[PDB]
Ligand binder design. Structure first.
Ligand SMILES: N[C@@H](CCC(=O)N[C@@H](CS)C(=O)NCC(=O)O)C(=O)O
Ligand SMILES: N[C@@H](CCC(=O)N[C@@H](CS)C(=O)NCC(=O)O)C(=O)O
Lengths: 207, 207
């Protein structure tokens, strides 16, 4: 399966950790966004939205990281541990995945990207949205070891890609004790952690 | 099942159309967000993220509209038509759901909300993001009647809730012929269209 990516990119890293958790070796293809490789006809034919990550599995093309993570589990997982079939367990995971995209990582992009990609001054009011997102995550973790229940799921892996990017951005995770505990645990149990962290250090260069 | 909502709210309306497509009558509960009803201790116990829509099924609380829609189909659907089990079919649906949240409806909120809720001048650069989102949707619709394939799915119902909100905002959907065709068809086939449209007319009052 082809996997169009950049190593620093959080949504790309969430997929790579899922692949490791499934014992799948993706064919990693760097896509040079700075050079506009994603905007040429050959890439637009695969993904007309011209985003990474993009997976190509035979003649099936797919994008949106969290869709790709779930696809890998549903198609290739030997059991449903990373994405349980039980509708209520799955639903908590899905809510956490939309949280990760539209609350947590959105707060990251909105506050950091203008500084690191557009040379704009930081906006303290956008920092407060990060604090709010971490507070929610801290609450979601009350009473459980993992983000959506009692075992490692794709919710954890998505959120871990995001929170590891906050670490290298110098965000003080320690102010959210449940998050800090969950994060330290995941560095020891999440498959593909080392590759995710190496990618975080590459992203860190932007700072 | 309890459903905390406002009729005007697009993410609420996507869930209502899914319930109607499943033959489920939700116990609809208006929430007074302007008065901070969602910020009270009682609501925070149900949904600490204090958002609508929120579903309560017995003792199980769930939020994120697109997670709720999929939960209703997975738990209560007599077949999987609205959310097929085939991993590739489901993955396209899921990518469209994330599109709806992070690209299409994001463009709506970013451009219109500052005008209708904050009395800020429109930002023409933010309008261009709506046009880009509609261009992508127009492309996604090439060669199929529905958003993620050849049958009505939750992807259609989420996108329909969003696009019908753009209609009452006076966005010119006719500039996107595949979107226009798909939209017109869904007004005739989507269960719960009349309730969705009544709710769009409520939202229109903010303009
Ligand atoms: N919500 C998407 C985000 C993907 C995304 O925005 N990727 C950026 C990474 S720099 C990108 O490819 N941007 C290029 C573009 O949108 O043209 C996901 O989770 O996969
Ligand atoms: N991505 C969420 C969006 C939910 C949302 O933002 N709802 C607004 C509707 S006005 C809300 O409840 N805001 C109140 C708050 O966040 O305190 C979904 O699809 O359900």
């Amino acid at each position: 399966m082809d996997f169009y990516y950049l190593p620093g990119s959080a949504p790309c890293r969430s997929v790579l950790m899922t692949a490791k958790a499934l014992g799948i070796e993706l064919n990693k293809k760097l896509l040079n966004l700075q050079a506009g490789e994603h905007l040429k006809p050959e890439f637009l034919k695969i993904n007309p939205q011209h985003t990474i990550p993009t997976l190509v599995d035979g003649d099936f093309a797919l994008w949106e990281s969290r869709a790709i993570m779930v696809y890998l589990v549903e198609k290739y997982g030997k059991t449903d541990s990373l994405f349980p079939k039980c509708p209520k367990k799955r639903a908590v995971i899905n809510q956490r995945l939309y949280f990760d995209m539209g609350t947590l990582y959105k707060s990251f992009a909105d506050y950091y990207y203008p500084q690191i990609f557009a040379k704009a001054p930081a906006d303290p009011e956008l920092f407060k949205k990060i604090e709010t997102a971490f507070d929610f995550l801290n609450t979601f973790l009350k009473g459980h070891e993992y983000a959506a229940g009692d075992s490692l799921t794709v919710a954890d892996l998505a959120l871990l890609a995001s929170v590891s990017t906050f670490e290298v951005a110098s965000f003080d995770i320690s102010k959210y004790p449940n998050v800090a505990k969950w994060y330290a645990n995941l560095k020891t149990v999440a498959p593909g952690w080392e590759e995710n962290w190496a990618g975080c250090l590459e992203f860190k260069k932007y700072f």
